[PDB]
Design a binder for this molecule. Structure first.
Ligand code: HEM
Length: 333
């Protein structure tokens, strides 16, 4: 099983130097947590412990570079595990414009440390995986990480026991009612509960309601909006997530560059990689806040995966940013 997986990963990595662990796990038809598991005794170590305690321990290491992704978009943010509030219904690590995470901790299953050779030299990380075996979040040490605290954290949580993963499979509405309840919300954070009640996916909800609430726009909309944001210099939010973790960039888009088959943002502390041909549907949605409404661009793949979502920057108590509204208005047929 896992020896053969390790060997095969070494072969495929040599053959495909441009491809990363997630892609090679994909070529092998295994989940990424299974590739981490196979690398134990080589360049990975299993970790154990209460997930909140591990996350709290990360505050001690200082700067990290965190990667959160789905199949179609990769979000990389340099910052610190400060301002943690992990204990509620969902968890958060609240640092607008730096490391800003929203956590669904019931999805968090296994954790590994990887200390690996790469073309750019040794990299160390702590990697979290869900019950399906998919990556949730990867936390990399940088040249600024407190490596004494990093080593102390690893000694605290690394275990020699690499126990079996036991991976698991993933688990007609009234349009007038859905619409009226959407209009009646007083905060965007109620929307997920709305979907859950009506047992709807996001796109199913968007297809039900009037166009002033959810309007389909060009699949080129993300490119258009990133070009406008880069030109205009207004702050936006870029959300990229998966079933267990969403990472949120807030700030100005400094550089947008297509490269190697992806649309990239190259900012000083943040990088986005988005596979543009993966966008199957793009929606502009309007949802109420306590002060007014806000407007989002929401992107979906063919399988219905939410690739990314964008908003303007906004502080509690303020109206939606004027420039962002103007940029979105340019998308509406
Ligand atoms: C102090 C706590 C939080 C603050 C200040 C905050 C702030 C925001 C802001 C500014 C937006 C953009 C829409 C708007 O302008 O109102 C937003 C949307 C969102 N937040 Fe939060 N948030 C918080 C907690 C959370 C938590 C705990 C979660 C989930 C774990 C979360 C998940 C989201 C999601 C998914 C959206 C997009 C909603 C949609 O359009 O459907 N947030 N949040």
């Amino acid at each position: 099983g896992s020896m053969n997986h390790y060997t095969r990963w070494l072969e495929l990595k040599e053959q495909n130097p441009g491809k990363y662990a997630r892609d090679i796990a994909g070529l092998m038809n295994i989940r990424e947590a299974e590739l981490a598991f196979a690398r134990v005794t080589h360049d990975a170590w299993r970790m154990h412990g209460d997930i909140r305690e591990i996350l709290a321990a990360l505050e001690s290491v200082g700067e990290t570079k965190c990667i959160c992704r789905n199949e179609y978009a990769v979000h990389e943010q340099v910052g610190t595990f400060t301002n943690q509030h992990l204990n509620g219904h969902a968890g958060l690590i609240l640092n607008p414009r730096a490391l800003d995470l929203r956590l669904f901790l019931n999805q968090w299953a296994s954790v590994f440390h990887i200390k690996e050779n790469t073309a750019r030299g040794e990299r160390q990380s702590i990697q979290f995986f869900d019950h399906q075996g998919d990556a949730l979040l990867k936390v990399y040490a940088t040249d600024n990480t407190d490596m004494a605290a990093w080593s102390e954290l690893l000694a605290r949580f690394i275990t020699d026991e690499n126990t079996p993963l036991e991976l698991k499979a993933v688990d007609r509405a009234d349009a007038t009612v859905v619409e009226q309840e959407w209009r009646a919300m007083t905060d965007v954070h109620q929307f997920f509960t709305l979907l859950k009640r009506h047992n709807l996916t996001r796109q199913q909800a968007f297809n039900l309601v009037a166009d002033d609430l959810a309007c389909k726009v060009s699949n080129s909309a993300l490119a258009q909006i990133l070009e406008s944001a880069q030109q205009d210099g207004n702050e936006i939010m870029v959300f990229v997530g998966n079933r267990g973790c969403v990472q949120i960039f807030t700030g100005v888009v400094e550089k947008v560059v297509p490269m190697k088959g992806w649309l990239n943002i190259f900012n000083p502390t943040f990088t986005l990689h988005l596979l543009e041909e993966s966008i199957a549907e793009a929606w502009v949605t309007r949802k109420p806040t306590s002060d007014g409404y806000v407007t989002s661009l929401e992107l979906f793949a063919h399988d219905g995966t939410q690739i990314a979502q964008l908003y303007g920057q906004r502080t509690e108590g303020e109206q939606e940013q004027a420039q962002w509204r103007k940029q979105i208005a340019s998308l509406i047929p």
